[PDB]
Design a protein around this ligand. Sequence first.
Ligand SMILES: N[C@@H](CC(=O)O)C(=O)O
Ligand SMILES: N[C@@H](CC(=O)O)C(=O)O
Lengths: 326, 326, 305, 332
Amino acid sequence: LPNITILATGGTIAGGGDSATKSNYTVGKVGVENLVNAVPQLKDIANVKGEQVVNIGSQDMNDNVWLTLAKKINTDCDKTDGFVITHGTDTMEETAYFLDLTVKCDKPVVMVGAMRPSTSMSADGPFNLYNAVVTAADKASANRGVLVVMNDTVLDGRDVTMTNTTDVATFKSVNYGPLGYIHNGKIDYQRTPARKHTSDTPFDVSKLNELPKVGIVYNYANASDLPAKALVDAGYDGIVSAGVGNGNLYKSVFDTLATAAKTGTAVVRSSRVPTGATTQDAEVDDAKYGFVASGTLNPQKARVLLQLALTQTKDPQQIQQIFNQY
Amino acid sequence: LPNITILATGGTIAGGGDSATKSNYTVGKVGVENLVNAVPQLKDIANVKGEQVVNIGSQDMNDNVWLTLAKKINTDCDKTDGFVITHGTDTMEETAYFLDLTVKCDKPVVMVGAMRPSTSMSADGPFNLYNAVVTAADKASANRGVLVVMNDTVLDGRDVTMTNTTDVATFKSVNYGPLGYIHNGKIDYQRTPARKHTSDTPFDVSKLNELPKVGIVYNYANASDLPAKALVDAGYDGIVSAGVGNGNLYKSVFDTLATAAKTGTAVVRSSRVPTGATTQDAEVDDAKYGFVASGTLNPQKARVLLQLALTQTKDPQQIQQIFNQY
Amino acid sequence: LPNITILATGGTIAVNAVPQLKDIANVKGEQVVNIGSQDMNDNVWLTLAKKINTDCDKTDGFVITHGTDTMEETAYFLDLTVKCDKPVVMVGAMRPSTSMSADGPFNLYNAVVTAADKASANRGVLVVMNDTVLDGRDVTMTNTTDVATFKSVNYGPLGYIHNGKIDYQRTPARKHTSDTPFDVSKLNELPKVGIVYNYANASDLPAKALVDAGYDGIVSAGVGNGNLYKSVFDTLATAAKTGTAVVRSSRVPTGATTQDAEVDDAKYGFVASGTLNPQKARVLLQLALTQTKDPQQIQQIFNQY
Amino acid sequence: HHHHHHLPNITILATGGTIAGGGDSATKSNYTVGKVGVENLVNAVPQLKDIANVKGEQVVNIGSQDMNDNVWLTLAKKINTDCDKTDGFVITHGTDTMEETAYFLDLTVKCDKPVVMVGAMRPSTSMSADGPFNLYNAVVTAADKASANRGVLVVMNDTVLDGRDVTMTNTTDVATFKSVNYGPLGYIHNGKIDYQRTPARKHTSDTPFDVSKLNELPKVGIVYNYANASDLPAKALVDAGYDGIVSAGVGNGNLYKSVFDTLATAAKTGTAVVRSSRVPTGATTQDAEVDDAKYGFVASGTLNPQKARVLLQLALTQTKDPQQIQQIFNQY
Ligand SMILES: N[C@@H](CC(=O)O)C(=O)O
Ligand SMILES: N[C@@H](CC(=O)O)C(=O)O
C-alpha cells in the first residue's frame, strides 16, 4: 500500500449544516483526522496521513496559502508516494493551476472537494476522497501534472473549471476533456496535458513570500473604466481582462488598459465566455498595445500564469511566449 | 407576407476582413441596406424595411443605444408585424434581456448576429439573418418575449448566453434550453419562458434618458477590493458580484459590498460559473447583509435586471421579489 | 402534508433509508414488480398505467422507483397513457444503495419533494434525478455511469431543486396524460415494434426477421438525420408498402430526424420521429398502432405527442 | 541565401457525402448526394492554392449512409500504397458514418503522414454552406507537420478530433462532431492549430491489423436493446453465421433477458459478442452487472456500438478468443 499524504485546507468537504435536507452550511467544521476516519475504506488502498494546513472556505483562498502548499509539497515530496489536497470547490480550479506550475514533485498531486457538505443526504465528499486517494496511489498518475478528481473523473489542473453552481458533476475540462475515468478503483488514462507543468516550468516559489499583484476586471455593456484605473493607480503588476466574446474590451476599458500596457502594467486579454481561446489576430492588435492573449486560460487561470510570469519577466513578448507554453 | 422591420446596430454580421481566409476583421462598417440586399431570399418570406440605429461593435454597446432601441421598437410596434435586430455577438445576450424587459409590443422581436465576418469562407451571417426573419414572421413567435436566433435555434432572451469565444454554435440557453429548432423555414416550438417578459413587466423606459449605474466586480483567489471601492466612490446605484461557486465573495470584496449595502447601494450576488442559480440558503445570509441573490441570471444579465429594478425601488426586499419574477 | 404513494419496480435504487421523508409527505409503498429495468417490458407498463389511473383518487401524488437503464422509456409510456393529472415522478439511482456516496437516498427525497409540489401537477410524467426535474418525453441518459446522466437533451429541464423547493421555468408543449387518446385501460398486450440499427455495411437480416415475424412496426436507428443503409432502406420500403408502420429515428443522441432532407417520406410511406430517439419512438409507435395503421395519421401523431 | 516557403502536396480522396451534395434551393433543406465531382469541390475553394498543392482523386461518390467494407478496404490500401507520393491526405466523406470510416482508417493506415477526414452538415447549395471552410481547415490540418503521429483525424467546425473518440452529437448541427469522452486534440484559428492532446490508444503503424491482402472483413452486426426487445435481430445474425455481434446495451451495456440468452448461446458456438451501450458517452465497463468472463463476452469500453463493430471486425482477422479480443479492446 502506498503512503499518501492528505493536506487539508478546509472547504465544503470539511463543512457542515444543522440538517441533512436543508442547503445551509459553513466550511471548516470537520478536521482532517475525522475526514479520513469517516472513510475507513481508505485503509484498503493506502497508508494515509493527514495534515491540516489551513481551514478556510476556498472563496477566501489567497497567495499565502498557495505559497505554503507549493513549499510543503516540494519539501515533503521525498517523504511520501503521493499527495491529496482537500479544498473548497469555489477556487479549486485556481489552486490546481498554481500548483500545476509550481510543484516540482512529479509524484501524483490530486486535489479534491465536495459540492455537498459532509452532513447532507448523499454527500459526495466520501466517495470523492476515496477516488482522489485511488488516483494519487496509481503509478500511472505521475508525470501528468497536478490533478483534480471529482465525480469519478481525473481532470488536469490547467483545463479543469466549474460548469455549474451546485451540480456534483460541475468540474469539467471544458476545452480539451478529462484525462481518465475511474471505475471500480481503476483508471483508464487516455490523455495527458501537452502544456508544460511541474518540474518543466521555470517558476520556483521556494524563497518567495509574496506574489506579483494581478487583478481581474469584467467587461459588459456600458462598463466603467474605474476598476481598471484603480488597479493601475495602486501600482498592480498586471491586469487580466474578462473580455466579451473573443477577449474584447469595452471602449473605455480598452483606452485605460492600452495606456497601462504602454506604461509598463502587464495586460492579459481573457474572456468571460466559459470555453474557447482568447485568440491573437482578431479585432485587437495585441503587438501594437503590448497586450497578451490568454488562449484557453479563463480570467482566473490567466491571473495565475500572469502572476508567475511576472516573477520571471515584465516583457510583453516574453509573457506571450509563457502563455503559449504553460 | 408579413411586414418585417430590421433595426441594425452593427456587429460582425455587418463587418469585414481584407481576406475570406484570415481571421482579422473590423465591425459595424456595412449599412443595413447593403446587408439586406446581400440576402435577396428575405423577399420570399417577408416585406423587409431596414433602419440604421447605430453601427458599432457590440463590445461598445451602452445604455444610450439600449434606450434608443427600446423607445423605437415601442413607438413603431403598431406599424410593423415584427422586428429583427442585427447586432454584435459579444453583448447580444445583454441587449436581448434588456429588450425582453422593456419592449411593451407582444409582436416578435428577434436578435441576430454572426460569429464569422461577412467576407469569410462559410460566413454564417446570411443564413442566420434568413432564419431570424423566418422566426420574426412566424405567428407562433409572438408572446414568447425577445428572442435570439442563431445556428438554426430559437433562444429566449433571458437564458441565452455565449458558451464559446468563436464557435458559430456558441449561443445556448444553458439552464433551460432552447424554445424551438428551425428546419426548412419552419419552427417546432416546444417551450416558452415562464419568467414574465415584455408587456407583463412593470419596466417602462419611454421617458428615461439614463439608467441607474450598475457595475460588475469579479471574484477570484486573493481578489482586490479596489474595483468594488471604485464603483462605490463613483456613487454607483448597484453592484453585481460575479461570485465564485454559488455566488460567494472573496473576504475583501464581501467587506466592501457589505459596507456599500449599509449605505443603500443595491448588491446582487451572481456567479462567474456559467450555469446554475446563485441561490439563497447556502453560505451567505442575504437578509443579514441586504443582498439579493441573482438566481440563474449571470453577472451581465443580473446587471440588466438590477438597473431596471432600481427604476422602480431601492429596497433590497423588493429587488429580491423582482429577481424572483423576471 | 400530502399523501404520496411509492410504486416500486426494482432497479439499483433498491423508505427507512430516508426517514426525512416524513417531514414532507405521508408516504406509503406498494411493490408492483421487482426487476432490473434492462428487463422492463410491455406487461409492466400496462400494470403501472392501469394502477396509476385506478388509484389516482386514493392519493395526492405518485413516485415510481425504477431501474435507470430504461427509465426514459417507461416515463414516456406513462407520459402518454396516465390520465391522473396529479404529480407522477419516476426516480432511480446510478450507484448501489450500499456504495459510498450512494445517490438513491437524496434522489428519493427530491422525487417526493417534486411529487408533493402543487406546481408539478399538469406537467406530464416527470423524472427527477440529480436535483433536476425532467419531462418524460425529452429525458434520456447521456452517460453510462455518471450520477448526472439524465438530461432533457433537446429542450432542457423544467426546473431545478434547491433546499427542497423548485423554480419551474418550463413545461412541455407536446400533448400528454389526459390530452392524448391513448387508453390502455382494457389492453393486455401492445402492438409489436422492434428497433433496427444502421451503420456501415448494415445487415438487412434484423429488419427481415421483424418483417417475417409480422411485427406491426419497425423503428430505424438511422445514421445522421435518420438515414438508412441501402439493404435496410429496401427491406423497410418493401415492408412499408405491405402494411408495416416504419419510423425513421436516429442513433445520434440529440436533434430531430426531419422530413425534407434526403428521404422522401411521403413517397415511401415512412414517418419521421422528430426529436424522439429510437426507444422513445418505439413507445409512441406502439401506442399510435392502437389507434391507426395509416402512415399519414401516424406522422400526425408524431407531430402532436 | 534566404529560405523559400514551399507548400506541401495534399491528396484529396473524395468518397461523396453532403459536402458534394446539392438541392433545388439555398433556403430549402432537401438535397441528394453523389452530384458533385472532386474537380468541382477543389474549383469551389480556390484558397486551397494558398496553403497546399492539391490533387483530387474520386474513389467513390456515395452518401455515407451506404458506406461499406469494400470502400474501407479501397481507402486503406490506397493510402498505404500512395503514402510516398504525397505529403498528406484529406478524405471528403459523408457525415453519417464518418466516425466509423475514421476509426477503421485509424487502425489500418500504416502511412504516418497526416490523414484528415472532412464533411459538411449543409449541402454545397445551402446558404452559409459549411463545406468550403471545413475543406480549407482539413487541408490546413493535413499540411501541419504537428498533425503527424496523432492517428487519423476528423476536422469539422474549426476543431481537430481523433478518429477513435470522434462521434456525431446532433442530427443537423454544423457543430455535431465532438470527441465526447476525451475531448478534441486542437482548435484551428487563422489557419493555425494549438494541439494540446494526442490519443494514448495505439493506432496506425502501432497496430497489428493489416488489410493489404484482404478483400472482405469478418461479418459483424449490431443489435439494439430497449424494453420488451425482440431476440429476432440477434437470432438472425447467429443463423447467418456472423463472426461477431455488437450489442447496443441499455445503461452500462446491459441486455434485455431474451437478447442475453441468445448472445450467451452465440458466444458458446463461436460468435464473438461485444457489449457496447446505446448511451452516447461513457464506458461499457467490466465488473458491473454482466460477468463477461463467465459468458465469454467482451466489454467495449468507451467505443460506441458502430465503433466497437470496427475493432471487433479487425480483432476477428487475428483471433476468435474472447480473452484476446478483450485485450484488443483495452489497447486500441
Ligand atoms: N466584436 C464583434 C463580434 C461579432 O459580432 O462576431 C461584436 O460583438 O460586434
Ligand atoms: N440495471 C439497473 C441499473 C441501475 O438502476 O443503476 C436497472 O436499470 O435496473
